[PDB]
């Protein structure tokens, strides 16, 4: 296995550290909706 006389390896490895994760960004998510409908009006007794 190509070691020392007591088991020490002659070749060393690498860790290969990851990229690490990413933060998630929150966006303005909107669903457009209208205003209320106009109902037909009545007529009063006063003047303008």
């Amino acid at each position: 296995h190509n070691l020392s006389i007591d088991g020490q390896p002659l070749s060393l490895a690498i860790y290969a550290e990851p990229t690490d994760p990413k933060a998630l960004l929150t966006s303005m998510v909107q669903a457009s909706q209208g205003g209320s409908a106009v109902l037909p009006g009545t007529l009063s007794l006063y003047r303008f």
Partner: protein
């Protein structure tokens, strides 16, 4: 509550028709269904006593 008051008042508004009636007490009492009588004569009599 006040807004509801105003809405009710304006929406149910109705400029009621106006009527005036003239009544004569002498004619009224003289024309009673059960006890028809002279009003002036009874007045003067009740004055006498």
């Amino acid at each position: 509550n006040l807004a509801e008051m105003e809405k009710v008042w304006l929406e149910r508004d109705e400029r009621a028709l106006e009527v005036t009636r003239t009544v004569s007490l002498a004619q009224f009492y003289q024309a009673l269904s059960s006890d028809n009588f002279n009003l002036t004569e009874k007045l003067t009599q009740f004055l006498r006593e």
